[PDB]
Amino acid sequence: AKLEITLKRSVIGRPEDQRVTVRTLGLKKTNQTVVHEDNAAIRGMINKVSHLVSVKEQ
RNA sequence: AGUCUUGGAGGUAGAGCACUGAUUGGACUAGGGGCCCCUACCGGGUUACCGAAUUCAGUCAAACUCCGAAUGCCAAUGACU
C-alpha cells in the first residue's frame, strides 16, 4: 500500500551518511509531506533512520 | 548517489591459551648438590635443599593467534526513490 513520510526533525546536526538518505526520499526541508509505496527498499531506509522521521501509514 | 537483495576480500573489539612469550599453584621427577653415613669424589642412603622435563587446574598480550562479530570498502544483480 501507500504510506506518508514527514519530518519532525531537521537534517542540520546529523552525519553525512544520514544526510543524503533524506535527499533520496525527496525530503529536503522540514515538515515536507511525501508519500511512497510500502516497499522493503524504502522500508530499509526508514529502518536505517527511524528517528528523524515520524512515519505515517494508511 | 542512497536503500534492499545475494556474493565476497580483510584478521581488530571481543574471546581463546592450540603456536609465541610471560606467569600462578599442586602432584610428580630425571638430575644436582647438601646432613653427611659407610669412605679410592668411589660404595648409597637421606630430606619438603633445589629441581629440568612431566601432566592437573590457573591466569595474561600493541609487535600471541587454532577463532572471530558489528560496521566500513570494492562489487554483481535487479527493484524503488
GROMACS .gro file of C-alpha atoms (C1' of nucleotides) in nm:
model
  139
    1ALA     CA    1   0.000   0.000   0.000
    2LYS     CA    2   0.095   0.366   0.041
    3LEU     CA    3   0.245   0.546   0.338
    4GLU     CA    4   0.321   0.907   0.423
    5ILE     CA    5   0.665   1.027   0.531
    6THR     CA    6   0.717   1.361   0.708
    7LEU     CA    7   0.981   1.519   0.932
    8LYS     CA    8   0.970   1.614   1.295
    9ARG     CA    9   1.335   1.690   1.258
   10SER     CA   10   1.595   1.885   1.065
   11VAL     CA   11   1.899   1.736   0.900
   12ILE     CA   12   2.145   2.005   1.012
   13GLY     CA   13   2.323   1.848   1.307
   14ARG     CA   14   2.330   1.492   1.168
   15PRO     CA   15   2.612   1.299   0.992
   16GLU     CA   16   2.676   1.271   0.619
   17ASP     CA   17   2.555   0.910   0.596
   18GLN     CA   18   2.207   1.003   0.716
   19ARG     CA   19   2.204   1.332   0.524
   20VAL     CA   20   2.193   1.205   0.166
   21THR     CA   21   1.932   0.939   0.252
   22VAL     CA   22   1.693   1.221   0.340
   23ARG     CA   23   1.764   1.374  -0.003
   24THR     CA   24   1.688   1.048  -0.185
   25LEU     CA   25   1.347   1.031  -0.015
   26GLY     CA   26   1.252   1.364  -0.172
   27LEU     CA   27   1.263   1.519   0.175
   28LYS     CA   28   1.452   1.849   0.169
   29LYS     CA   29   1.320   2.093   0.430
   30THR     CA   30   1.130   2.012   0.746
   31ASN     CA   31   0.759   1.921   0.755
   32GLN     CA   32   0.764   1.828   0.385
   33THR     CA   33   0.499   1.557   0.348
   34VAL     CA   34   0.599   1.290   0.094
   35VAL     CA   35   0.407   0.971   0.006
   36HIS     CA   36   0.559   0.649  -0.130
   37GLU     CA   37   0.468   0.283  -0.165
   38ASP     CA   38   0.511   0.023   0.108
   39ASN     CA   39   0.822  -0.147  -0.031
   40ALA     CA   40   1.112  -0.306   0.156
   41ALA     CA   41   1.360  -0.083  -0.029
   42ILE     CA   42   1.217   0.236   0.120
   43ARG     CA   43   1.146   0.045   0.443
   44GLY     CA   44   1.519  -0.026   0.468
   45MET     CA   45   1.584   0.348   0.464
   46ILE     CA   46   1.332   0.405   0.743
   47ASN     CA   47   1.474   0.110   0.938
   48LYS     CA   48   1.815   0.271   0.888
   49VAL     CA   49   1.696   0.605   1.026
   50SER     CA   50   1.354   0.586   1.204
   51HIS     CA   51   1.433   0.889   1.421
   52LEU     CA   52   1.440   1.196   1.202
   53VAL     CA   53   1.106   1.076   1.068
   54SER     CA   54   0.759   1.027   1.210
   55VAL     CA   55   0.617   0.753   0.988
   56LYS     CA   56   0.256   0.760   0.873
   57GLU     CA   57   0.069   0.456   0.745
   58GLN     CA   58  -0.270   0.447   0.575
   59A      C1'   59   2.435   0.858  -0.508
   60G      C1'   60   2.106   0.600  -0.118
   61U      C1'   61   1.822   0.167   0.037
   62C      C1'   62   1.701  -0.363  -0.015
   63U      C1'   63   1.895  -0.804  -0.241
   64U      C1'   64   2.287  -1.236  -0.291
   65G      C1'   65   2.831  -1.257  -0.335
   66G      C1'   66   3.277  -1.197  -0.124
   67A      C1'   67   3.817  -0.956   0.028
   68G      C1'   68   4.007  -0.837   0.525
   69G      C1'   69   4.215  -1.054   1.082
   70U      C1'   70   4.062  -0.557   1.511
   71A      C1'   71   3.700  -0.506   1.968
   72G      C1'   72   3.587  -0.939   2.182
   73A      C1'   73   3.711  -1.415   2.312
   74G      C1'   74   4.094  -1.849   2.336
   75C      C1'   75   4.579  -2.017   2.551
   76A      C1'   76   4.640  -2.488   2.037
   77C      C1'   77   5.200  -2.156   1.834
   78U      C1'   78   5.461  -1.743   2.061
   79G      C1'   79   5.630  -1.523   2.502
   80A      C1'   80   5.508  -1.405   3.019
   81U      C1'   81   5.328  -1.620   3.471
   82U      C1'   82   5.046  -1.876   3.942
   83G      C1'   83   4.988  -2.344   4.236
   84G      C1'   84   4.981  -2.861   4.343
   85A      C1'   85   5.123  -3.360   4.236
   86C      C1'   86   5.547  -3.596   4.026
   87U      C1'   87   6.068  -3.628   3.890
   88A      C1'   88   6.545  -3.708   3.569
   89G      C1'   89   6.938  -3.483   3.761
   90G      C1'   90   7.203  -3.168   4.100
   91G      C1'   91   7.441  -3.054   4.530
   92G      C1'   92   7.389  -3.068   5.073
   93C      C1'   93   7.316  -3.355   5.666
   94C      C1'   94   7.658  -3.639   5.552
   95C      C1'   95   7.692  -4.243   5.651
   96C      C1'   96   7.980  -4.624   5.502
   97U      C1'   97   8.464  -4.356   5.266
   98A      C1'   98   8.990  -4.456   4.604
   99C      C1'   99   8.470  -3.760   4.457
  100C      C1'  100   8.440  -4.406   4.479
  101G      C1'  101   8.002  -4.797   4.768
  102G      C1'  102   7.428  -4.528   4.898
  103G      C1'  103   7.111  -4.369   5.184
  104U      C1'  104   6.860  -3.934   5.300
  105U      C1'  105   6.542  -3.464   5.332
  106A      C1'  106   5.992  -3.055   5.195
  107C      C1'  107   6.785  -2.846   4.994
  108C      C1'  108   6.677  -2.744   4.496
  109G      C1'  109   6.496  -2.910   4.076
  110A      C1'  110   6.474  -2.960   3.413
  111A      C1'  111   6.119  -3.223   3.197
  112U      C1'  112   5.610  -3.420   3.321
  113U      C1'  113   5.096  -3.369   3.344
  114C      C1'  114   4.647  -3.144   3.657
  115A      C1'  115   4.389  -2.695   3.734
  116G      C1'  116   4.505  -2.148   3.679
  117U      C1'  117   4.566  -1.651   3.479
  118C      C1'  118   4.782  -1.274   3.083
  119A      C1'  119   4.928  -0.964   2.540
  120A      C1'  120   5.038  -0.308   2.076
  121A      C1'  121   5.455  -0.634   1.790
  122C      C1'  122   5.014  -1.440   2.083
  123U      C1'  123   4.669  -1.638   1.717
  124C      C1'  124   4.352  -2.282   1.603
  125C      C1'  125   3.898  -1.848   1.642
  126G      C1'  126   3.631  -1.423   1.520
  127A      C1'  127   3.143  -1.006   1.515
  128A      C1'  128   2.915  -0.526   1.427
  129U      C1'  129   3.015  -0.181   1.074
  130G      C1'  130   3.315   0.042   0.694
  131C      C1'  131   3.506  -0.079   0.132
  132C      C1'  132   3.534  -0.280  -0.354
  133A      C1'  133   3.112  -0.547  -0.609
  134A      C1'  134   2.745  -0.800  -0.937
  135U      C1'  135   2.229  -0.804  -0.954
  136G      C1'  136   1.754  -0.620  -1.005
  137A      C1'  137   1.393  -0.305  -0.757
  138C      C1'  138   1.246   0.183  -0.568
  139U      C1'  139   1.324   0.695  -0.475
   0.00000   0.00000   0.00000
